[model samples]
Target: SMNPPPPETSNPNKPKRQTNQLQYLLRVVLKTLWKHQFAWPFQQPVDAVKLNLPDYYKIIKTPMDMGTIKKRLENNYYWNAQECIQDFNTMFTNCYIYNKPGDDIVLMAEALEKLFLQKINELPTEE
Candidate 1:
């Protein structure tokens, strides 16, 4: 016969759940960007050659494509916006750390926000 699991014990000294500001911001940004169906900026594959991404950023043997991005969006049965944002942030950080693209990341982020705003404005107003 299988043994029963032991009872759980609560510890007062155990660290409580902590909120991370960066993760909060990232979640907010991703949720906002994903609010509108057409406002997804990361829908298409990023052109590494055009962007002049560093070699380290192109670690994959095959050409950089949006397959993973598309899959993530489509397979939401297990994934959430936060997970998607984490993947994007990892890629962005790698590029930023390696290429040191000054202001470009900020510019892109701003442009994405602008697009989201434009999309929101284009929506039909409720009566």
Candidate 2:
């Protein structure tokens, strides 16, 4: 199996609660942002979860934004719409999306098709 089987003591539905404090703080921030009100005191930036990326060979040849690339390779974690848009913008900004010397439309189109196929094949199937 590509992924290791769950441990005997593992509850697949429930993640460990080691970082309960951080989780709580993040919840407060999200709730306050949703309410359109800022929290009274500024706290240190919360540490993001460490993501485990897949082998580089699994990704396509095309350039990817650091954040989006991180999420995608991290067990194909799904990104929210906002996150997706942010990553797309980052990718476009960093890549020669609109203009680049030696870039041919026909070649770019063919390469894009191949990249799409690679991405499709990399996705986990619904069993």
How high is the lDDT of residue 79 in model 1?
26
**Each candidate's root-mean-square deviation in Å?**
14.5, 18.8
Q: Which pairs of residues collide in candidate 1?
A: none
Please, what are the lDDT tens digits per residue for candidate 2 over residues 1-127?
0323211222345433323222322233223322322211111111122223232213323333333333332332322323323443434333344335455533443343344344334433332
- Name the best candidate (by lDDT): 1
Q: Which pairs of residues have clashing backbones in candidate 2?
A: none
lDDT of each: 0.41, 0.31
The TM-scores, one per candidate, come to: 0.35, 0.23
C-alpha-based local distance difference test score of model 2: 0.31
Candidate 2: worst-modelled 10 consecutive residues by lDDT = 39-48
Error of 1 at 112 (Å): 6.4
Q: Tell me the tens digit of each residue's lDDT in model 1 across 55-82.
A: 5334632222123433434333222334
**Candidate 1 at residue 118, lDDT?**
54
